[PDB]
Design a protein around this ligand. Structure first.
Ligand code: BEF
Ligand SMILES: [Mn+2]
Length: 117
């Protein structure tokens, strides 16, 4: 299965890529909202882990845009942890929303849960 990791912070992207690689997933990365939409269209990932505070296009806009044509599972992963943040992310189409800092094991379990459908 292929995972697209969207995060503008390379250190965070690297930790998630390391962990998902360990589970046997193919990993593709994007460092801004524009790269996120470009990788989504070119790679057709099976699941997207999506940061919200991103340059060019924010994660909420990336999710809304992607939802116009795809039901690809989206797991939002952000330091933004307010009730409004989680509710709007889910209402715009996210299937799950995890806050930073996060547990690598819990992220792995939620990706498996989403892929399980
Ligand atoms: F920049 Be992400 F929203 F933590
Ligand atoms: Mn960010």
């Amino acid at each position: 299965k292929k995972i697209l990791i969207v995060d503008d912070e390379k250190p965070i992207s690297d930790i998630i890529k390391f962990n998902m690689t360990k589970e046997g997933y193919e990993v593709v990365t994007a460092f801004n909202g524009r790269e996120a939409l470009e990788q989504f269209e070119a790679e057709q990932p099976d699941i997207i882990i999506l940061d919200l505070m991103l340059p060019e296009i924010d994660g909420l806009e990336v999710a809304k845009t992607i939802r116009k044509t795809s039901s690809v599972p989206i797991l939002m992963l952000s330091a933004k942890d307010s009730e409004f943040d989680k509710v709007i992310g889910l209402e715009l189409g996210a299937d799950d929303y995890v806050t930073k800092p996060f547990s690598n094991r819990e992220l792995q379990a939620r990706v498996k849960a989403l892929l399980r459908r």
